[PDB]
Amino acid sequence: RKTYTLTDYLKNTYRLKLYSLRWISDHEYLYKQENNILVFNAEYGNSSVFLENSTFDEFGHSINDYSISPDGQFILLEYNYVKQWRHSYTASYDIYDLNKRQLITEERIPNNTQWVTWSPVGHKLAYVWNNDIYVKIEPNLPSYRITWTGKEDIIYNGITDWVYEEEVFSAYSALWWSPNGTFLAYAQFNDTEVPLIEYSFYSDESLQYPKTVRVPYPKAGAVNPTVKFFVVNTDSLSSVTNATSIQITAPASMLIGDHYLCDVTWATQERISLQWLRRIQNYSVMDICDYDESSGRWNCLVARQHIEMSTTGWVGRFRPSEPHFTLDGNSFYKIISNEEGYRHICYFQIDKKDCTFITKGTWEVIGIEALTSDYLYYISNEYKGMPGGRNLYKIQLIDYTKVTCLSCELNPERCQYYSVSFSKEAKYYQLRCSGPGLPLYTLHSSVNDKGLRVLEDNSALDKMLQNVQMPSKKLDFIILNETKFWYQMILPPHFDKSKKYPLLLDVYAGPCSQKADTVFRLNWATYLASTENIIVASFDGRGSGYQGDKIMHAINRRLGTFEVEDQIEAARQFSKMGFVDNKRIAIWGWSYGGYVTSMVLGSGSGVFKCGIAVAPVSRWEYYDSVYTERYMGLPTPEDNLDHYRNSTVMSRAENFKQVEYLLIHGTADDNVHFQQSAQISKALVDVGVDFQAMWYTDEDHGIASSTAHQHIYTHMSHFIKQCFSLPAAASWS
Amino acid sequence: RKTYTLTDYLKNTYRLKLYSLRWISDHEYLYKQENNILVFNAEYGNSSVFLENSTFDEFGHSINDYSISPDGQFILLEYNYVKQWRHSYTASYDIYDLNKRQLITEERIPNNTQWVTWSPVGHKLAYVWNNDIYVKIEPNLPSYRITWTGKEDIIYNGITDWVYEEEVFSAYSALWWSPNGTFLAYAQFNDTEVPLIEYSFYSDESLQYPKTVRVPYPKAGAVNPTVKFFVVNTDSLSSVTNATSIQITAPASMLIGDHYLCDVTWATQERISLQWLRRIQNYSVMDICDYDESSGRWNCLVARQHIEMSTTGWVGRFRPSEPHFTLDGNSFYKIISNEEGYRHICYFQIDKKDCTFITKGTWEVIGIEALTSDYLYYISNEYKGMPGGRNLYKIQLIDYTKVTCLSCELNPERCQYYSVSFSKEAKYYQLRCSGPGLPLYTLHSSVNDKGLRVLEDNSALDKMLQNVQMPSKKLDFIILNETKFWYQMILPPHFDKSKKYPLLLDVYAGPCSQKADTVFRLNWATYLASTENIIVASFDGRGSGYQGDKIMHAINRRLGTFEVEDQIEAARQFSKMGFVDNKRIAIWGWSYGGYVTSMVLGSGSGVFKCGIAVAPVSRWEYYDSVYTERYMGLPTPEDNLDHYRNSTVMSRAENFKQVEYLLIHGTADDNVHFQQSAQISKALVDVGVDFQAMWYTDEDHGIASSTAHQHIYTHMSHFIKQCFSLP
């Protein structure tokens, strides 16, 4: 049979089918089929055409995405999409009136709009344009301007700045509608004193002078953005007077120094919760604020504050977890690290500071998925004690011992990694199995957890793959100091334990990372194993996630130590297994994985022949404040400067004489600045070490344009094949 | 025997000795030996100590260079040297009184001085600090501030901006003292509307945020700097009132549009010549301006104005040539292209517009070296009709038939490439032979052109090289269309014509370039031939210099055409010779050579297996106005935009699928911006071509720091050895 080739990976020859649905009520969902939008009845599976595909070709522009208003009366059409950072972008928007069957051409949403969202009920709109918030009560009516302070690179109303987008909210939006749309809450960021990262952008060859891009970006220890929080009543807006936004200030325990706003969650129509985090990220406070009809303001009762702190590390996996409120808003459930360091669900009364754990054990709750008056639904890695598996469970709120696994036994050989999507009041749920077999999407009814139907089983892909020599995946563990550490191996087809294969260690190894799991993937590793007969291994060592704080917090204030040593030890253990050619072990990684790859290659271990670092961090003072300081503290003599100075790639330059290294970086990387690799290369040149390099003009952290993505994987494949003494092949052109 | 290795090249194991002297009169010169400065009598060769190496033992700073005042009374000590561009730098200066044995401690030259020069006689000083000119009449006395308009990156008084430094004057200074030091002439450049090139500078690893460097740099067709010219009388300066500078305006034929000041040459104590060039560089005007004692003004009479134009190309090799005036300033000699397109010496009377050619032939005069009362001394490539040779000649002013070759027959097998250094009134001259044998420095008397003595013969290097398997050099020509085109080959030791060797074509090929010559060099090519047994060839095709305008102007308005095609043809002709392995032909070059290498690799010729481009130009709109427009005109639809768009490397990207390419560039290149290689790589990625790259953090066009220089040649050697399958 044929193998899974590099061209198969780069041209997406073998495509994974999805079943992306959008719940619109407790019994119906929308699903896009052959460019038409269909509405499905969950109980019976029958459908009706909601919006014909022809409608999308009526405007003359190509439509990037759509958003139907919750009441189904309007459709927001997104076009002229222009990407900014990981989540941010600008676009033009048109609104189509579904009952009048006509495009709205008056009081349009402006071009270069930064963010738009419908209210959660009805059809109000809030949008951000030129860093200011606007609200439209009706799609054809003039907007009400909420803020007047917006200023490019300085004041951000209702949108995040660079560091809040990447590191705090994982979103460009900083707008939160109340459940029924009466109130609009928003954050305002002030970057006045934040230094700018500056880099060249070359653009099309017609551009005679390169542009200098300047982005407010706080590097470790630098001046951070400041934040304010406001709530506006959208039902009392006037065309005669400016809108009154009510400020909610941070608690004084936060105002004493630098801090962040890290979570916004509405509890009821008149109650909002906010979580704040100190700049030293081991102390956070939740405020619960109620609307006061007598003053028109928001009161955050001091008696309702909840403190969450950590003595061994930072708070949360990446940030404090979100609360899930009961309907009355008087209690909530939240994932918290317990006394043993395992993340479990805790039940709180809004006026009481001691919470009660409702789950326990040497495993962790990943997320709370739905909450009804009778049950709480959650995803955990409890099943078979496999940290890299995921299953859906339900717990009776009247008896915590009554826990049922909803997904564990549905198809145990094919499905060990689930996510879920519940209908509006959780009468139904879609289960999404992503491995170890081909992804499988199914629909279920909550009343008795009855399976209704299979939505997508990837039978088309299965038929195609029967004719390909596909690799296999092994997930297992090694024991180090009486602790299990998990690894995975992508094994070549017809794997023979009596033969010696070359091995590539694929690394991430950042705090809370997980690279050993049960997910089915078709990626570069699939080609390396299928066509090139390379074993591609990954290992989750100290600092990795979902296995408790004793493992995750092991690298607290000490990045570039145990997680680096544990990758080296894993490669030694893989050599001890007997089917690995110890003369052909390589390592590669991107981002944090590029940093770890570089630290490993500079260790002088003698284990690795070669390695590739893509967009690596090289020195923690070059990376952003929020992520870096979470694990490293501040780069000051009084805090952790000594470790910042001891954990650079540059200090290990002399040891690179022992290895073959390929260093790759996009010149327009706004995230891990090209500076980081420019300093690695300069250090290697300064000690006389030869190495290979590749810059990618105008590519960012993703090196994700169609042509650059094909080019980088082609270049890396040649490098690994040459390191491993694997043959080349001529092609006509 | 051992070979000449890469470490020998990088560590300078085998050193070429020089003999750098400084003439102080018509009979004596200074020579630095064992840090002592000696004064030599040219006639007899005896010496005396001028300044002992112990004088400045307690100075407290490492001295970079020195400059003795023309009257020998003072010495300027340069220290704290900080490089800027190719020529520019700043430094600190101390003045030491050689008679009193005292360092000047008051009214010192400021730190961060941009330029300093003694007057040509005596000991006045002019300097530029913070873009303004200052004059000191005596080293211990306060300075007179001449200009008050200087402003970083905007107004430059007495110093050049980036483009005038690189492309017009080949110097940072823009100050010209009159012969006896009475007047100080200077240019002022105004870069207000010139766009800025911006690039990152990463600095030491301790720098948390990269710096953005911003330099006023006009790319092709962009707004250029403007220029003004002034003359100040330094004998009538006052501590009470500000100095009066007299402006000399450009002629109306220049003021009608954009133009450049391209030459300043004093003719007498009261007469200065200026040459101006239109932005379309095929028309130049020389004004001869006289001081008017009655008005205090400088007048340039049209009766003494001379035009120089070209109908086939630009004016001059790189710019209009310098005039050499007779002592009375009533006539001058200048190299001009003749009716046949060969550059020869023309004699002009200041008020007569038709000049008389004093030399002629199918060869060219390279430079006028000295003009005495009876003879003119010049360097040419006449000898044996070899364009890549250089010899010194003299011609009698009253009889152009009385020519003597002064260097041709001295040592004809060892020496075919000379330069010269004459004493103050040319009674003596030092000849400097740079090849084809080991360099040889000798001293001569011009009384009857008799040799006095050998100054340095490199016998120490010769003894060391006898134990090394050194390569040889062949210089010859091929005939194409009844025209000779010259090439050179660096041949491996024990070269066997019956065997096939890999070949590397080392390219420059820019307008007026010459890569085939008789110079002896110890460089990367020496290692490739000596250790790796690679033939390193270079070829001078259309557009090359010193062979007349029919060859040089062949690429006018058409860069990236004939000079590219002729490198490909040369490699085909080298294959036709029989000792070349046609499966192992590579090409490399730096700067314009990187552009030609890239254009050749993108040609689809199938001749070359691999190549390396270092800091290449990729598209002429990215390079500076003065150099680019000289050959290309303006990038406008009405002028030459179509050819600017047709001559890019990016347009050839698909053809790179046929070759192995290594692209290298310094990130802080202020000259050929990193942008140029960033656009090549993006075009190759866009068509799915694999290639090799290397950036050099914070390196400029020279990639010349000790560590980066060693790294780039090591990386390139690995690449060529892998291309040629050499262990």
Ligand SMILES: *[C@@H]1O[C@H](CO)[C@@H](O[C@@H]2O[C@H](CO)[C@@H](O[C@H]3O[C@H](CO[C@H]4O[C@H](CO)[C@@H](O)[C@H](O)[C@@H]4O)[C@@H](O)[C@H](O[C@H]4O[C@H](CO)[C@@H](O)[C@H](O)[C@@H]4O)[C@@H]3O)[C@H](O)[C@H]2NC(C)=O)[C@H](O)[C@H]1NC(C)=O
């Ligand atoms: C290289 O060697 C050259 C040859 O010796 C050096 O030239 C000589 O320089 C000295 C000093 O400048 C000259 O000295 C005296 O010259 C006359 C007398 O000249 C007669 O006698 C000389 C031998 O003693 C002969 O060489 C002459 O040809 C001639 O017959 C004196 O009258 C001078 O006296 C005056 O100056 C001195 C100070 O220098 C005072 O002390 C006296 O009181 C008086 O005022 C000189 O003593 C010498 O003439 C000259 N010889 C030449 C050129 O032939 C040359 O300097 C040296 N170069 C270097 C760099 O080392």
Ligand SMILES: NC[C@]1(c2ccccc2)CC[C@H](OC/C=C/c2ccccc2)CC1
């Ligand atoms: N910039 C940080 C990351 C990075 C890149 C480059 C160098 C170093 C590090 C990239 C993103 C990633 O996000 C984790 C997701 C968190 C999340 C999201 C939603 C809800 C809860 C948590 C972590 C590593």
Ligand SMILES: NC[C@]1(c2ccccc2)CC[C@H](OC/C=C/c2ccccc2)CC1
């Ligand atoms: N920037 C132009 C040059 C260049 C670099 C990079 C890309 C393209 C081109 C470099 C310098 C060089 O100068 C020649 C010398 C002229 C001269 C000097 C003194 C007196 C008379 C003539 C020509 C090519």
Ligand SMILES: *[C@@H]1O[C@H](CO)[C@@H](O)[C@H](O)[C@H]1NC(C)=O
């Ligand atoms: C599905 O069928 C029922 C009748 O059994 C009907 O009421 C419902 O509207 C249908 N839904 C869709 C989306 O077609």
Ligand SMILES: *[C@@H]1O[C@H](CO)[C@@H](O)[C@H](O)[C@H]1NC(C)=O
């Ligand atoms: C958006 O831009 C287009 C193109 O310039 C313009 O025609 C249109 O009117 C703009 N729309 C709005 C809402 O301003």
Ligand SMILES: *[C@@H]1O[C@H](CO)[C@@H](O)[C@H](O)[C@H]1NC(C)=O
């Ligand atoms: C932003 O912060 C700066 C201080 O860094 C302050 O001067 C300015 O008033 C603030 N602007 C707003 C709109 O809050």
Ligand SMILES: *[C@@H]1O[C@H](CO)[C@@H](O)[C@H](O)[C@H]1NC(C)=O
């Ligand atoms: C609203 O605020 C803006 C900005 O401060 C101001 O220009 C405008 O006049 C205000 N409008 C009213 C109606 O007060």
Ligand SMILES: *[C@@H]1O[C@H](CO)[C@@H](O)[C@H](O)[C@H]1NC(C)=O
């Ligand atoms: C939405 O909530 C607000 C605040 O309690 C309330 O005044 C309003 O009536 C609610 N809307 C509806 C439709 O009940």
Ligand SMILES: *[C@@H]1O[C@H](CO)[C@@H](O)[C@H](O)[C@H]1NC(C)=O
């Ligand atoms: C938070 O971290 C700092 C730095 O390690 C430490 O001084 C402080 O005590 C920690 N706080 C808690 C709650 O442990």
Ligand SMILES: *[C@@H]1O[C@H](CO)[C@@H](O)[C@H](O)[C@H]1NC(C)=O
């Ligand atoms: C130059 O700088 C040094 C060091 O600061 C200082 O001592 C000296 O006085 C300065 N010279 C002048 C002329 O200002």
Ligand SMILES: *[C@@H]1O[C@H](CO)[C@@H](O)[C@H](O)[C@H]1NC(C)=O
């Ligand atoms: C420099 O030129 C600008 C116009 O480009 C002009 O405004 C300015 O006055 C000039 N400055 C001097 C000192 O000549």
Ligand SMILES: *[C@@H]1O[C@H](CO)[C@@H](O)[C@H](O)[C@H]1NC(C)=O
């Ligand atoms: C000289 O010119 C400068 C700059 O215009 C001025 O400040 C100074 O007063 C002038 N001095 C005299 C004496 O005129």
Ligand SMILES: *[C@@H]1O[C@H](CO)[C@@H](O)[C@H](O)[C@H]1NC(C)=O
């Ligand atoms: C220098 O030349 C000028 C101009 O002719 C003259 O006035 C001056 O006196 C000359 N100086 C000497 C020392 O002869």
Ligand SMILES: *[C@@H]1O[C@H](CO)[C@@H](O)[C@H](O)[C@H]1NC(C)=O
């Ligand atoms: C100078 O060059 C331009 C452009 O080629 C041309 O129009 C003009 O005629 C030239 N002048 C001469 C004297 O050839």
Ligand SMILES: *[C@@H]1O[C@H](CO)[C@@H](O)[C@H](O)[C@H]1NC(C)=O
């Ligand atoms: C030789 O002449 C031919 C015919 O005109 C031309 O195509 C070719 O470019 C010339 N080659 C040279 C001058 O090297």
